[PDB]
Amino acid sequence: ESSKTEQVTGATGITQSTVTAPLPEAVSSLSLAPTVNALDPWVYLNQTEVPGGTFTVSSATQPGSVLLELEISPELNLYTSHLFRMYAGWSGGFSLKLLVAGNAFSAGKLIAAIIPPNIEVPNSAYLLTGFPH
Amino acid sequence: VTAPLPEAVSSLSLAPTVNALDPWVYLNQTEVPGGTFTVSSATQPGSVLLELEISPELNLYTSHLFRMYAGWSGGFSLKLLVAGNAFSAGKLIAAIIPPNIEVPNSAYLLTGFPHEILDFRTADSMEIIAPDIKNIDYHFRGDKLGKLVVMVYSPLRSTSADFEIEIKLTSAPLPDFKFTMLVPPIQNNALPIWSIPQAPPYSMVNPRSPLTPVVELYINSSYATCNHQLGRYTIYQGAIGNSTFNPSGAWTATCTAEAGSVTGHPNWRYALLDLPDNPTFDPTLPPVPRGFCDWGSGVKSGNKQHLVCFTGKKVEGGFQDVDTHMWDYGDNETVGLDNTYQRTIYIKDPSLEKDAQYLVIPMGVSGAANDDTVQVAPNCYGSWDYAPTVAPPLGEQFVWFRSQLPASKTTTTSGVNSVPVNVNALMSPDLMCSAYASGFPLGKVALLDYVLFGGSVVRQFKLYPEGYMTANTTGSNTGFIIPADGYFRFNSWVSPSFMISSVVDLNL
Amino acid sequence: ESSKTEQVTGATGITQSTVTAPLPEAVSSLSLAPTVNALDPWVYLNQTEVPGGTFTVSSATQPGSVLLELEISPELNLYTSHLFRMYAGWSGGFSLKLLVAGNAFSAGKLIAAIIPPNIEVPNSAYLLTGFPHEILDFRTADSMEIIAPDIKNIDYHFRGDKLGKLVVMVYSPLRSTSADFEIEIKLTSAPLPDFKFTMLVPPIQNNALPIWSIPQAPPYSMVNPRSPLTPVVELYINSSYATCNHQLGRYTIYQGAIGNSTFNPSGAWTATCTAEAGSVTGHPNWRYALLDLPDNPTFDPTLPPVPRGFCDWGSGVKSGNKQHLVCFTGKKVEGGFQDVDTHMWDYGDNETVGLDNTYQRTIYIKDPSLEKDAQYLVIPMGVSGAANDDTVQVAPNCYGSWDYAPTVAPPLGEQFVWFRSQLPASKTTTTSGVNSVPVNVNALMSPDLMCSAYASGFPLGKVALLDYVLFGGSVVRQFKLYPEGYMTANTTGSNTGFIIPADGYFRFNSWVSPSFMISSVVDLNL
Amino acid sequence: ESSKTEQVTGATGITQSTVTAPLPEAVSSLSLAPTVNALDPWVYLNQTEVPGGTFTVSSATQPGSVLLELEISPELNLYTSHLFRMYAGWSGGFSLKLLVAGNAFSAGKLIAAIIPPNIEVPNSAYLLTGFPHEILDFRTADSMEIIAPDIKNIDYHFRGDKLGKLVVMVYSPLRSTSADFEIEIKLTSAPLPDFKFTMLVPPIQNNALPIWSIPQAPPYSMVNPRSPLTPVVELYINSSYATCNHQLGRYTIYQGAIGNSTFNPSGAWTATCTAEAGSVTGHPNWRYALLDLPDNPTFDPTLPPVPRGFCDWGSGVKSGNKQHLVCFTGKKVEGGFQDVDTHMWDYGDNETVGLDNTYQRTIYIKDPSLEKDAQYLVIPMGVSGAANDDTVQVAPNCYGSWDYAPTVAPPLGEQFVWFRSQLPASKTTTTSGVNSVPVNVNALMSPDLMCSAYASGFPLGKVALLDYVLFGGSVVRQFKLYPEGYMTANTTGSNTGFIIPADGYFRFNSWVSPSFMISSVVDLNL
């Protein structure tokens, strides 16, 4: 959990870069698989585009419409997906970076949230505020 | 943060039991149900945007929990999120009103209560403390509560093109919040979420033309008011005026003929409607049978457009020969008849008896317009409990359920022909049952989404518990159509001053 | 708890001054309002007279009769009452000082007691002895200080709670050699230390004030809601009028205008009429008419049946065979213009009832040229050829108006004041039928003197003692104004049609109880 | 003296919040009043809006024009004003907070200054710079706190002294790309520490109150002092009436009733006439009469020459050859009875003067059967056969009444509201001569809405902003009431005989200056 602020060229605004953890992670001991298989350290430092992970917001976009919906799995995105061909199981979380091309002379707000398994996704930001967001 | 009034912490003694909340409800902020607003350059100073009782209903989880509890205390912490811009200027007031004191109607008097002034330039993520003011140990249900009031102090202006500003509130209970138990989970509180079963409008009855299905959902800006008496339902009272809850069965009626005729054409004679409740012994009860179309005939005659009804004569076991006749209402009497709801009518039938009984079923009109001649109900003079005339707020337009009435033509003896017409109505009873079961937060409006083409970008409507829905439009006012194959899914609670972001372009 | 004794000048007695606390005070911690608001220390040292806190004991006063009954609240008396306009709550007790003008050559005893909330006050000193009480003897008492506590089960008070009371009553009757001896009791009060206020709401309730100021407007610049076209020329008292059944000129606190009354009686409020063809059996020219009724036309048995304020009349009895009212009637409505004249009229005459009680208020106009379904304008007022001053006083019997104004009477020993005016006769020398006679019309309170009362307000359960100043001389009279409401003044004697000028003005004096005896008498002997 | 800078959301500017003391405060020892009275600590922490402390700056506002001018006194604003009812004196300064709604993409500058007592306020920012002053820039200002001192040469204040002032004015004009941009300035205030009161007089002055409460009495229950027998049925605005020379229905604060006005106009106040035998040259039947004049009968050139309140009329010009007033005249006084009918009449007609200006107010009645030295009763009202709605509006020229009511006009951009009513025609079908016509009569303020103002009072040099609520819908309009006094409302457009119902009610809003611009417009296009 942290926040950096930077000044834009020809100072007429700022850019914020934040790190947040809405839900604490419960790390598993993996005691039922004494066959733990390690990855390639460099795979932890390469952030790749998510399939189906791009969207456009115009003035005609409504709140409550679902723009992005993605499962947390090795299918994020390129190298864990390829590595999850030689293996039978997996466990662990993911760092997801959301890049926004904003400007200091606009207005509006986005909301992102984490939804547990077997729970339906609602179509209201009002209801999304009840999740870790 | 800011705390206009200190929060006095109560030691809950002797509450029979002190019931704790799980620790995770205190650490997350949710949206406040009903705490959403827009400010525009047209909002006047001193307009009360937000009026919000300080109770367990300020948070999404405490209001759900506050249905199996009998008491509570105390306060909340609120966070203000403002979607502002670089060019705007203005100021708001936020004040705390203790009980049992009245809310003033001017900004000059709000100062005087504990308050805070918020500027649009710096009130972007701002924390306020709403305290629980009481002289008792804990609250029971039905107690008098303090309020948070948000009003415009300095109007909104801009240095460039004018933007609107949208404001939302999130909340979390303070660490000293506690409940007092125990009761079953049905306790009179409005649920923070309203679950509407999916039902297309075409599967709903039209209360002003029961035998014709609904085809649309159309808008027309020339209709700035509604004085109807049939399609009127609310949340608190249910059906009002002369309304059911069943347009069909209450459609037909009976009348008793009278010895008399109108001066204009003696061929049509008077009659008095039969009231099975007999509210002629009492002028404080409705003078017309429940149901019984409130059309819809304008200035009287000379060009003598009338209504049309299937009518017959009463005999043993039923009714003998039935025909179509013209019956609207008395011609030029003092009460505006034919422009008033009354027990007195006439029918165009020289063969009418004196004390006989006649069945009447309204079916159409003749010589009239397919437009605002039937859209206007006659009148509701008297002392009984008639439905008041209502209008939408400035910038908003009504949404009507609509049906097509076909024309009955004749060729042989009657010479009575009807005209194809379109009949529109306010809320249908089939969209309010779940509302009645669930309930509305005090002084709030339901923002709903109408889903149309499998989940495309789609319309947004406001539903008012007085029993009517409206939309935000711009442009011309020629009759605008919308299909009738949607879902009416619930979006959120908003204040009555909220302005819908989605706009309907009435130009096509 | 203490007692001081002092010797009187030329020692022939003593005066006792005591401090007593019959009930211990429970000081509240005020932990549920961390917004405690402090008063001005000097407010704790100024004892002021309590409204309605004066009484007189004579040899005719019985034990068990309740002389004083006062709630413990900020309304004691002047500065806490004014300060309790900016605040929402309060808590604390009061010091109540009871001053007695005794003498060493009398006899008798007083009892004072404290009564908790929701307990009825009894009418027996024997029963009062069961409360926390104190006793006084008339031969030595000078002042008694009572530490009256604030009995509550809440942390602090909002408005509308039930409060404890102090009750003062005679314990043993007064005796003396002189038959004219009386003892006057007076009450002062101040807030005790630990009295506090709570949340400061500088927004002020418009009814948040002690003593109210009446503007100096003489009665002659006032209606008269029963003869508006004529001005008020005098006040007057008559002993024979012990009741009032009027429906006009009836204004009250807490309701506004009651009966068939209104705040704009200018002119004898006009009306319009139209009804069936038909006449009274006592004359073939006494045609029937029905008053046109706007303002809920549909004849609901709960709404008034006469137009608001039209009820200008006299009376009224079957002797009306020789008595009638006189009205300017316009016989038709024709594009605004109306042919107008004067005519006789009265309320319905069907000896089935001695009709003063018409429901739709059927009338007759004594006009043979009257149409049936036409509309006729009617404007009072006149009378002929009756006595008739006493007939106009008694109003028509009223049960048509469902929420009608009740009959009122003054308490024993008092009479009304009856704003009075004159109306002359409109005589005719050419054609027979219409000649009226002069008559004086009285009326109760007018809206002009009550608007100030509405703006200011009245303390709950008290009346207003006013002084009528009429200089040119140096004369001041005293009146009691009730919020029912009406004026009375302490008469003694028989009727003489007592007259009082209308050029003086009203100035406010203390608040008093409805049973208060005015210390000023008007001699109805002249 | 301090300054805080804050960054705005989405950093594109800053907001400055400053505290400044242009003039040092001289704290008085209060040694001549050893009766110092302390306030409630929480009163020092509640800043409230100042009455008349709001203004708007647009691109059209000039420098040198005075936008705000306020005296330093307990009347700032709510709780010291209420507390200064129980006390006789005061001393101490005030914290005045000036809130500005600026934006980083505008330009311009404000100047505020402190002006000592008995010094005239100039109309130039150049000259204001010679006072103790502070400057603000619209791009960064959010709030400025001024420690306004109490400039006095006495130990403490009684009522009636001359006080220092705060003046706010534009220093450099406002500019922006958008033509609709304006900046709103607001003022709040609180007492500084060391503010104190002196001798406690819990006796309260009846004019010792901030905001006043108007009772909910709709206009339709009001005279109409120019047509009392008819009720008020609507309010209305007409652009063609930019002046008022009426002598009736003119009520003002600080004087009461002015002109030939009274508080009891019920009925078109009757009068009596008698004068020489003589007729107008324009007809041998236009006989002369002189109004009987009680209330200082002797014709003093300083007392009014018409009976109080009788002045019911229209107009008035020599075209009166085809225009006349209509009155019910009783042709004789005979033991109370009078033979009554209707007749034509008007004010004197001697083309020497276009006579609206009769001194003794000679009239004529157009009656050949009139005696010379007899007394005749006269009661308005009617007109015929003139246009004539616009003729009744213009009153007869007045110089006979020495202390007559002056002509008044609204400020540019505003129009009157003109309580309006209708009076119908009295038509005749039998004999020639007397047929009237329907006409609408307007009038300024009525006594009913002013009695509350008299009871409460007005702050010196300020007007009342009222809200007219007319529900059934959800409509609220805004009016400005002046104590001269009359109502105006911010019109835009041309005359359309604009009509407003009379069933709403008046509710008090803030006090404002006479130059205040209402933030609510009525479109006279319909």
C158 touches B100 (CB < 8 A): yes
Give, rounded to a whole angstrom, the gap between the first and last alpha carbons of chain D: 55
Q: Which residues from C are below 8 Å from B114, CB to CB?
A: 199
Q: Select from B83, B493, B502 the Cβ nearest to the Cβ of A107.
A: B83
CB–CB contact C340 D202 (8 Å): no
C518 touches C465 (CB < 8 A): yes
Give the burial class of D460: count Cβ atoms within 10 A of its Cβ; 0-12 exposed, 13-18 middle, 19 or more buried. exposed
Q: What are phi and psi of D244, to 5 degrees?
A: -145, 120
Q: Which residues from A are below 8 Å from B31, CB to CB?
A: 125-126, 129
List beta partners, residue A5: A16
Looking at CA atoms only, how far is residue D252 from chain A in angstroms? 53
B243 touches B439 (CB < 8 A): no
- For B34, the token pair is 């009903």
* Kind and range of the H or E run holding C126: helix C125-128
- For B254, the token pair is 């009976």
- Alpha helices in D160-275, H assignment, sequence order: none
Map B352-370 to HEC letters: CCCCCEEEEEEEEEECCCC
Q: What are phi and psi of C20, to 5 degrees?
A: -140, 150
Q: How far apart are CA D162 and CA D72, in angstroms?
A: 10
D212 touches D456 (CB < 8 A): yes
| Nearest alpha carbon to residue B307 among B356, B253, B353, B259 | B253
- For A35, the token pair is 């066959």
3-state secondary structure of B125: strand
C216 touches C475 (CB < 8 A): no
CA dihedral sign, ordered C287, C293, C298, C302? negative
Give the burial class of D274: count Cβ atoms within 10 A of its Cβ; 0-12 exposed, 13-18 middle, 19 or more buried. middle
- For B394, the token pair is 């400035």
CA dihedral sign, ordered C302, C303, C305, C310? positive
D69 touches D121 (CB < 8 A): yes
DSSP assignment, residue D341? E
Q: Which residues from D are below 8 Å from C197, CB to CB?
A: 40
Looking at CA atoms only, how far is residue A1 from chain B in angstroms? 15
| Nearest alpha carbon to residue B478 among B367, B401, B371, B365 | B371
Contacts of B471 (CB under 8 A, 6+ apart): B219, B396, B397, B399, B459, B460, B461, B462, B500, B504
Biggest CA–CA distance in chain A, Å, is 57
Q: How far apart are CA D48 and CA C417, in angstroms?
A: 48
- For B445, the token pair is 């409006």
- For B140, the token pair is 């029971």
Q: Which residues from A are below 8 Å from D11, CB to CB?
A: 11, 13-14, 104
Q: What are phi and psi of D404, to 5 degrees?
A: -80, 165
| Nearest alpha carbon to residue B59 among B80, B79, B32 | B32
- Alpha helices in C265-417, H assignment, sequence order: 389-393
Considering only alpha carbons, which residue of chain D is nearest residue A107?
D10
Q: Which residues from B are below 8 Å from C34, CB to CB?
A: 6-8
The total number of residues shown for chain A amounts to 133
CB–CB contact D99 B88 (8 Å): no
Considering only alpha carbons, which residue of chain A is nearest residue D9?
A13
Q: How many CB atoms lie within 10 A of CB D325?
A: 24
D207 touches D85 (CB < 8 A): no
The sheet carrying D133-137 orders its strands as: D66-71, D165-175, D107-115, D133-137
Considering only alpha carbons, which residue of chain B is nearest residue C298?
B382
Q: How far apart are CA B220 and CA C284, in angstroms?
A: 62
- For D270, the token pair is 């009757």
3-state secondary structure of D136: strand
Biggest CA–CA distance in chain B, Å, is 88
Inter-CA distances, B35 with B81, C13, C514, Å: 11, 76, 53
* Kind and range of the H or E run holding C466: strand C463-471
CB–CB contact B157 D101 (8 Å): yes
Q: How far apart are CA C16 and CA D378, in angstroms?
A: 73
The total number of residues shown for chain D amounts to 526
CB–CB contact B28 A132 (8 Å): yes
Considering only alpha carbons, which residue of chain C is nearest residue B106?
C203
Looking at CA atoms only, how far is residue C48 from chain B in angstroms? 29
User: What residues of chain B have any CB closer than 8 angstroms to a CB in chain A?
Assistant: 28-31, 33, 60-61, 81, 83-86, 163, 170, 193, 449, 457-458, 460, 489-493, 501-502
Q: How far apart are CA D479 and CA D509, in angstroms?
A: 10
CB–CB contact C299 B283 (8 Å): yes
D48 touches B112 (CB < 8 A): yes
Q: How many CB atoms lie within 10 A of CB B269?
A: 20
CB–CB contact B6 C158 (8 Å): no
Looking at CA atoms only, how far is residue C93 from chain D in angstroms? 20
Contacts of D376 (CB under 8 A, 6+ apart): D272, D273, D274, D289, D329, D330, D331, D332, D333, D365, D370
> How many CA within 13 A on the CB side of residue C273?
31
| Nearest alpha carbon to residue D86 among C457, C197, C509, C83 | C83
Inter-CA distances, B89 with B159, C272, D100, D184, Å: 9, 60, 9, 9
Peptide bond into B227 cis (omega under 30): no
3-state secondary structure of B474: strand
CA dihedral sign, ordered C299, C304, C307, C308? negative
Q: How far apart are CA C264 and CA D448, in angstroms?
A: 9
Give the burial class of B501: count Cβ atoms within 10 A of its Cβ; 0-12 exposed, 13-18 middle, 19 or more buried. middle
Helix and strand numbers (H, E) in chain C are 4, 30
R_g over Cα of chain A: 18
Amino acid, res. C74: P
Q: Which residues from B are below 8 Å from A63, CB to CB?
A: 501
| Nearest alpha carbon to residue A133 among A117, A109, A115 | A115
Q: How far is CA C143 from the centre of its chain?
A: 33
Q: What is the resolution of this structure in A?
A: 2.6
User: b/e map of C422-433 (b: 16 or more CB within 10 Å)?
Assistant: ebbbbbbeeeee
B454 touches B485 (CB < 8 A): no
Q: How far apart are CA C235 and CA C420, in angstroms?
A: 6
CB–CB contact B158 D142 (8 Å): no
Q: For chains A and D, what is the number of CB pairs under 8 angstroms?
A: 11
Q: Select from D200, D262, D455 the Cβ nearest to the Cβ of C215.
A: D455
B162 touches B42 (CB < 8 A): no
Q: How many CB atoms lie within 10 A of CB B182?
A: 11
Q: How far apart are CA D75 and CA C479, in angstroms?
A: 37
Q: How far is CA B180 from the centre of its chain?
A: 35
**Which experimental technique did the depositors report for determining this structure?**
cryo-EM
3-state secondary structure of C320: helix
Considering only alpha carbons, which residue of chain D is nearest residue A13?
D11
Do strands D196-197 and D183-191 pair parallel, antiparallel, or not at all (unpaired)?
A: unpaired
> Chains with ≥3 Cβ pairs under 8 A against D?
A, B, C
CB–CB contact A124 B492 (8 Å): yes
